[PDB]
Amino acid sequence: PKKVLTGVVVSDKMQKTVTVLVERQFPHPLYGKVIKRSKKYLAHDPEEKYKLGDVVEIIESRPISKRKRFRVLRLVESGRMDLVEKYLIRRQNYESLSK
Template sequence: MPNNRRRLQGIVVSDKMQKTVVVRVETVKRHSLYGKVIRTYKKYLAHDESDSIREGSVVQIVESRPLSKRKRWVVEAVLEAPTDAEAEAAALEAENAEEELEG
């Protein structure tokens, strides 16, 4: 029986919840009239059973049954894990972005 569940690839932008990560998926489209390439981003909550995936990791997520109100995806594989320096830089960048939004 074929597995027809959707699979997406994205970057983990938050790992602060228990057994849950926020994955940002990029979609590239062309404008129908002008032909300009437009990048759009969408965030998905994904289940991480091992709770070991860190911010900055590139992961593949697969569609599943609803696990909670907003969580309908499960992390299938970690394609690329960040080094310690990259993880610290990503965390620092996220803090700076939050501070800019607040003030």
């Protein structure tokens, strides 16, 4: 089965492409606590439909470019801007923690 994932769109910034943020949960292999990781995916949005803050489905596809292996299958829920918010803040915190 072509893999299907579910994510929020954290980036509108490219042409015909969205950055889709996909969380994942699982027991830590030793310590056992359920831990939640995440991965950004570049997905193909040709019709430029999917906006910032959309929870969409992503599907494994024939490679569109380097780094784009997925397409945007459907819009599951619109307007989750808080997810985007957490993403942007996590990013912004990088500005500390160097020199």
